[PDB]
């Protein structure tokens, strides 16, 4: 009875706690890496079922950046397989995780996933396993590295600025505030360039799956532009800390400049309306207060 094993096993493994006890018991319950797959799968399933209700509702690309505790439990489902030495099943199973993360818009879930496990090794080991099992497969060889991963440079940028601010405040404890502004000005500029530098491409490969270039475009079309918009409000934000003469015209000019759009959103408006809807919503605001 396949069901009855799966359950008794999953519960045994979970009810034995300590990472080393887990490690060896999972490691040595395997052979052939084709029906050993099944024993671990129910252990995978309980791990997911618990956190299932706590899991984020996004199953589509939207706002959802950064790993929380809920994610980590899901990552652990895959960890059970790795410990078992189940490279046959694992090469398939890596690609499937990466796709769910891509589809629900979790670039950070993938990124972190990418540090702890990497696809490229998995495909090379696969080939060697089917020399001892002799099951047919097509050439699956991978050399994939990260290159999705321009988000780490964003975070790097912020941190230097922030370090000035702690140190800047320390310097500020009765000294000379203008000299501290010169330095702060230096920091914002250099950080701003720094975020725009660094490119990770390296060896050119994908996830051991094609037709995923489309998926990556959409995720970028969200978070990327959101952040861009945030930054475009950020200048205004910073320009309200230390008193300084003039320097207002630059901001005015930028504001004016943000009027020459270039993709045709008005054509979209023409296509189906809401431009209209926006007048209706304005009118309701005006009848409440003008």
């Amino acid at each position: 009875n396949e069901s009855d094993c799966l359950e008794a096993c999953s519960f045994i493994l979970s009810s034995l706690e300590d990472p080393q006890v887990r490690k060896k018991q999972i490691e040595t319950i395997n052979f052939l890496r084709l029906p050993a797959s099944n024993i671990l799968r129910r252990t995978t399933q309980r791990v997911f079922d618990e956190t299932e209700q706590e899991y984020s509702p996004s199953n589509e690309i939207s706002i959802s950046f950064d790993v929380n505790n809920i994610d980590m439990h899901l990552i652990y489902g895959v960890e059970w397989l790795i410990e078992g030495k189940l490279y046959v099943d694992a090469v398939h199973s890596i690609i499937a995780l990466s796709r769910r993360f891509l589809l629900n818009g979790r670039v950070k879930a993938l990124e972190q996933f990418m540090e702890r496990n990497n696809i490229g090794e998995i495909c090379k080991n696969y080939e060697l396993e089917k020399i001892a099992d002799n099951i047919s497969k097509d050439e699956n060889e991978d050399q994939f590295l990260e290159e999705i991963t321009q988000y780490e440079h964003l975070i790097k940028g912020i941190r230097e600025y922030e370090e000035w601010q702690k140190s800047v405040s320390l310097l500020s404890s009765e000294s000379n505030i203008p000299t501290l502004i010169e330095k702060l000005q230096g920091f914002s500029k250099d950080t701003f360039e720094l975020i725009k530098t660094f490119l990770v491409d390296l060896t050119s490969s994908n996830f051991a799956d094609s037709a995923d270039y489309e998926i990556l475009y959409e995720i970028r079309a969200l978070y990327t532009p959101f952040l861009l918009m945030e930054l475009h409000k950020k200048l205004v934000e910073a320009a309200k800390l230390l008193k300084i003469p003039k320097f207002i015209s630059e901001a005015l000019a930028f504001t004016s400049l943000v009027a020459n759009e270039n993709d045709k959103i008005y054509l979209l408006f023409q296509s189906s309306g809401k431009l209209k809807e926006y007048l209706d919503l304005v009118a309701r605001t005006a009848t409440l207060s003008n």
Binding site: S14, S15, L16, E17, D18, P19, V21, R46, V47, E50, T51, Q53, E54, S56, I63, S64, N68, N69, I70, M72, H73, Y76, S172, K233, V236, K240, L241, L242, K243, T285, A286, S289, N290
Partner: protein, 617 residues
């Protein structure tokens, strides 16, 4: 040491003292033997007091007096440390004299030791702190009184009929001083970085607290129903509870002072400190984890709920989830079963299952950020940004207090008018239940047409009017106006207006069997640091009712130009003056007030003014 046959102190200081002590003891043995329950627990208790004092003073002295070298070393080390705190006081043989008090001798000593404890590294000194604490505070009262005197023969605890709460010597001041000490001493054991040594110190305080609360309920006997129609000490050092208990237990866990967690929790009645110790584990050792699993079925709410508090609050969520499969079902029960000390930890779990909480920023970005204003106002953004920058002259949170007031006075009027206006439009009207009646309710209805319109009216008028209206924002309008813009008026005129906001609160308070309402609003003031900003009188019990700040200005500002019936107002004022006095002179009611006021004042390093009211210029 006066008498025909009582010498003015023979011999060794300790020898005559022992002679005297024999005399005090003998008197007690005689009250125990013959007169024990025929004598009230007042006068007799004063004989016990003699021992407590003596024990503490001599112990401190004697350690140093071991060898001659140690005493000479002591005088140098102690003098030097005094210099760092900019003070002086060397001891030997100017200690011992044993003044007749109960905890007060301990109080004095403790402060002095803690003072020159932060520069100190001396070990004779360290040693000396522990002996003073234990002999007087723990040992004097409980282990040289309750255990070895009352519970054998002599009897009459402080929970048997006393003055009207406790014996004559025990008063409000003592209870309030204890509350302070708890937190100052917890700070101090982190500071020396040898938290472990000062467990004992900590143990005494928690013990003394628990005992005391029991004394209060047993003196009137039964369960709370006369402390819920008149707050006293039985909640006055469960203020600092939640946050601090959980923090201090957590700090102690990993540095394996597991015992230290257990005591704090045990006296204030929570399974969380014991349970969190066991759980400190990653998950290591299969046998132990299994044992915890057993306890889920055996105690499905009690053990289960307590356990969650560690894991949610301290975010050891890995344990919560896989490790414990059967606790997901109980984790829902926890949300469906909250109020004692399980609401506070439960909200965090809920918003973090959803993984977003960014909703607050969107609503904020419209109203604080100068980006989306009016519906046909332009130039708003420009003014508002320039204004924020100017009040930025002073460092951090504190703004330049003079610049702030000129904007603030007219703003708080526009905002006040507007708050009721939204309300009036809905066809809703705001009044209190005992202010429903009379001249003010009628005047209010005429005024309803007026409040739609916007026009600058005086802060004195606004202060008086608003405090009698329902709703939190409305009640805030009097406190706001005064803190900031009250210091545009004279000091005496500022305080008198203040008494008046307070007075209305007392009326309401006095009318209900809610006794906690006044406490919360007094507490709130120091948390928003209103006395640090713009000058606002600090909560006092000699600030609630003012009547020595007779200014004709006050007369012409409040009642001379605001249109309310003179007869009515006068009558309310007489009533107001009576109610403040009753809380201020009824014993239980002073305990709740005094206690609460003084601790918060100390922690914040405030001083009650009756001039400037400046706690941060």
């Amino acid at each position: 040491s006066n008498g025909k046959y009582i010498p003015p102190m023979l011999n060794t200081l300790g020898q005559h003292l022992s002679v005297r002590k024999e005399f005090f003891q003998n008197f007690l043995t005689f009250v125990a033997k013959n007169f024990n329950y025929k004598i009230s627990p007042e006068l007799k208790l004063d004989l016990i007091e003699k021992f407590e004092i003596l024990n503490c003073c001599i112990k401190f002295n004697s350690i140093i007096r071991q060898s001659d070298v140690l005493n000479d070393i002591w005088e140098k080390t102690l003098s030097n440390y005094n210099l760092t705190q900019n003070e002086h006081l060397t001891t030997k043989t100017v200690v011992i004299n044993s003044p007749d008090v109960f905890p007060v001798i301990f109080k004095q000593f403790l402060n002095h030791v803690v003072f020159v404890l932060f520069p100190s590294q001396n070990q004779n000194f360290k040693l000396n702190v522990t002996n003073l604490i234990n002999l007087c505070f723990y040992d004097g009262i409980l282990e040289e009184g309750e255990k070895t005197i009352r519970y054998e023969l002599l009897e009459l605890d402080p929970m048997e009929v006393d003055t009207s709460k406790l014996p004559w010597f025990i008063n409000f001041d003592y209870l309030n001083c204890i509350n302070q000490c708890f937190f100052d001493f917890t700070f101090a054991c982190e500071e020396e970085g040898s938290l472990d040594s000062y467990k004992e110190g900590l143990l005494k305080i928690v013990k003394i607290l628990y005992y005391q609360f029991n004394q209060f309920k047993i003196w009137i006997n039964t369960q709370p129903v006369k402390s819920v129609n008149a707050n006293d000490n039985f909640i006055n050092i469960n203020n600092l509870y939640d946050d601090n208990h959980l923090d201090w237990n957590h700090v102690l866990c990993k540095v394996n002072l597991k015992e230290q967690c257990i005591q704090i929790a045990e006296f204030y009645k929570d399974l969380s400190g014991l349970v969190q110790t066991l759980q400190t584990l990653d998950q290591n050792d299969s046998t132990t984890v299994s044992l915890y699993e057993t306890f889920f079925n055996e105690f499905p709410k009690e053990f289960s709920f307590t356990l969650f508090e560690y894991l949610i609050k301290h975010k050891k969520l890995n344990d919560l989830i896989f490790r414990f499969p059967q606790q997901h079902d109980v984790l829902i029960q926890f949300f469906q079963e909250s109020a004692p000390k399980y609401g506070h930890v439960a909200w965090i779990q809920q918003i973090l299952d959803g993984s977003y909480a960014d909703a607050m920023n969107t609503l904020k970005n419209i109203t604080v950020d100068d980006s989306k204003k009016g519906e046909s106002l332009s130039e708003c953004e420009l003014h508002l940004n320039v204004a924020k920058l100017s009040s930025l002259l002073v460092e951090k949170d504190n703004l330049d207090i003079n610049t702030l007031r000129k904007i603030q006075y007219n703003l708080d009027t526009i905002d006040a008018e507007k708050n009721i206006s939204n309300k009036l439009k809905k066809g809703e009207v705001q009044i209190c239940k005992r202010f429903k009646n009379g001249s003010i309710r009628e005047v209010f209805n005429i005024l309803v047409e007026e409040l739609k319109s916007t026009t600058v009216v005086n802060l004195s008028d606004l202060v008086e009017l608003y405090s009698m209206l329902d709703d939190e924002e409305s009640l805030f309008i009097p406190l706001r106006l005064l803190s900031v813009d009250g210091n545009l008026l004279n000091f005496e005129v500022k305080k008198f207006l203040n008494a008046l906001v307070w007075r209305r609160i007392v009326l309401l308070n006095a009318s209900n069997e809610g006794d906690k309402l006044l406490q919360h609003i007094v507490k709130r003031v120091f948390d928003e640091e209103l006395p640090k900003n713009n000058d606002f009188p600090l909560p006092s019990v000699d600030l609630l009712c003012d009547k020595s700040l007779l200014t004709p200005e006050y007369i012409s500002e409040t009642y001379g130009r605001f249109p309310i019936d003179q007869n009515a107002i006068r009558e309310e004022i007489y009533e107001e003056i009576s109610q403040v006095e009753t809380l201020n002179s009824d014993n239980s009611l002073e305990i709740k007030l005094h206690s609460t006021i003084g601790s918060v004042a100390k922690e914040k390093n405030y001083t009650i003014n009756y001039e400037t009211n400046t706690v941060e210029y």
